[PDB]
Amino acid sequence: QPRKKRPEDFKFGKILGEGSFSTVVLARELATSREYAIKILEKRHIIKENKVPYVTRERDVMSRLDHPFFVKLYFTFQDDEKLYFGLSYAKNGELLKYIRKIGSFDETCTRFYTAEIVSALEYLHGKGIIHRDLKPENILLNEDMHIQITDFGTAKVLSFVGTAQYVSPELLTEKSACKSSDLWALGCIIYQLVAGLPPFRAGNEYLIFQKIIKLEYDFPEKFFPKARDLVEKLLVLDATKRLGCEEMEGYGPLKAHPFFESVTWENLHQQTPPKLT
Ligand SMILES: CN(C)C[C@@H]1CCn2cc(c3ccccc32)C2=C(C(=O)NC2=O)c2cn(c3ccccc23)CCO1
């Protein structure tokens, strides 16, 4: 394999963002001029907060993925103090940014991006991997405005509860995650694209969780009817009754939903995304 890379091989630039246990920094490789998003973690901190399993899982899961709709892990290295993961730089940033900018997506854009997310989940679930924290913050956009899903340290390969707005009722009642937990999140995301806001909203996490377990949400007027029907088939309390799950016979029936009638599923990454407003 190519020589193990080192910090001195790069010109580090701006911080892209900061998390509780990592910082992602844009960096240009001197030998190639390539730009990578480098995620940097301090070994001592990860060890003190008992996060070794999550960092290990992040590397291991991303190393297994080989599909256009995921961020790529190109390389890893470490110095005495830090771990460095070299990732795709998804130049257009978070899907959440576009939701906030545009407001609500039109039906064409909703369909196209939902289709890419579904296709990505089909790939992931096919590998027996559950994301467990699917949300617009973690669905990035490349330079060509195709999706690139990230954030795999908290994945489950067939304890953790993800972002409250997207939490499935089973994680609150049974303390257990399955592939269908990601399908509930998909439902929330479709709703969010169409309505501009996610379906379960309240002033704190407790109040959100109470809404989720009671299925307490409503659709806005003019919500595209076939998208409403799809969301109703994903936001189902019983995880074995969600469209897409193995007990509902998998991704075929989901991709066959009438909302997706005009979608060509075989080659979405080669299609030109519709312009967002
Ligand atoms: C915790 N926080 C850092 C996660 C949050 C949004 C989530 N996030 C983006 C992110 C990662 C990597 C590992 C976990 C979570 C990530 C990535 C990138 C990137 O280019 N490739 C990535 O995989 C970016 C991170 N950021 C970007 C801003 C604008 C463009 C691209 C960004 C900062 C926002 O990151």
Side-chain angles (χ1 to χ4, degrees), residues 7-221 223-245 247-265 267-273:
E8 304 49 58
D9 293 328
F10 303 87
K11 179 180 182 195
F12 289 87
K14 69 183 173 180
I15 296 165
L16 294 171
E18 293 168 65
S20 51
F21 300 97
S22 65
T23 298
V24 180
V25 183
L26 184 57
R28 190 176 300 269
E29 181 178 30
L30 292 178
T32 66
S33 86
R34 295 170 157 161
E35 284 200 302
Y36 293 98
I38 299 191
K39 174 167 174 166
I40 303 175
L41 311 97
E42 193 199 73
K43 284 184 269 183
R44 191 168 266 95
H45 190 206
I46 290 306
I47 286 162
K48 304 203 153 169
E49 295 305 313
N50 300 102
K51 294 303 182 198
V52 181
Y54 299 98
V55 179
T56 301
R57 185 153 18 184
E58 185 169 34
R59 184 178 178 185
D60 284 356
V61 165
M62 294 191 78
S63 69
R64 289 174 59 194
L65 303 175
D66 185 27
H67 186 286
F69 293 152
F70 299 87
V71 170
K72 186 160 171 182
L73 178 59
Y74 285 89
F75 53 80
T76 62
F77 60 88
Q78 59 184 277
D79 63 17
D80 289 350
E81 297 89 21
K82 291 170 178 167
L83 306 174
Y84 301 78
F85 298 167
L87 309 166
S88 305
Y89 176 37
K91 291 189 160 172
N92 281 314
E94 300 171 17
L95 178 62
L96 184 51
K97 182 181 80 180
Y98 296 94
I99 295 176
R100 284 178 176 168
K101 181 190 283 293
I102 302 305
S104 64
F105 281 22
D106 70 18
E107 186 168 359
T108 296
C109 291
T110 296
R111 166 173 307 111
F112 183 83
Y113 286 104
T114 298
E116 296 206 329
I117 301 166
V118 167
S119 193
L121 287 176
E122 182 178 24
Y123 175 85
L124 196 69
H125 289 183
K127 307 197 116 36
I129 300 164
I130 299 161
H131 192 303
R132 304 204 292 181
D133 205 3
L134 190 69
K135 53 180 174 180
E137 172 180 303
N138 283 340
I139 300 165
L140 310 183
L141 281 303
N142 72 13
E143 65 174 8
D144 291 334
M145 289 292 289
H146 292 269
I147 73 171
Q148 305 267 268
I149 298 177
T150 195
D151 195 20
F152 283 98
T154 46
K156 169 161 143 173
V157 180
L158 297 177
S159 94
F160 174 76
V161 169
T163 300
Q165 283 87 344
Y166 309 91
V167 166
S168 53
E170 60 267 26
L171 297 201
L172 303 166
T173 52
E174 303 168 6
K175 207 182 188 157
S176 64
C178 57
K179 294 173 178 180
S180 198
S181 308
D182 291 340
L183 296 172
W184 172 281
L186 170 67
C188 290
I189 293 160
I190 296 166
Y191 181 105
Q192 189 173 1
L193 297 177
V194 178
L197 295 170
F200 309 101
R201 303 191 302 280
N204 63 48
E205 283 191 328
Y206 177 81
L207 293 167
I208 293 162
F209 293 159
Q210 181 176 66
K211 288 190 172 182
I212 289 158
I213 64 170
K214 299 172 99 176
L215 202 62
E216 185 179 297
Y217 81 106
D218 314 275
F219 291 91
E221 265 76 46
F223 197 103
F224 314 120
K226 282 164 185 183
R228 174 169 173 160
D229 188 76
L230 173 57
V231 168
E232 293 170 338
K233 286 174 178 173
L234 292 168
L235 297 184
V236 181
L237 296 174
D238 185 344
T240 69
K241 289 177 169 344
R242 300 183 192 139
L243 199 57
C245 80
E247 298 93 349
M248 296 292 294
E249 315 314 334
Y251 279 83
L254 177 54
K255 292 160 74 187
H257 191 271
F259 184 59
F260 303 124
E261 185 165 26
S262 65
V263 174
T264 292
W265 291 98
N267 71 338
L268 287 158
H269 88 106
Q270 286 154 349
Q271 294 170 38
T272 304

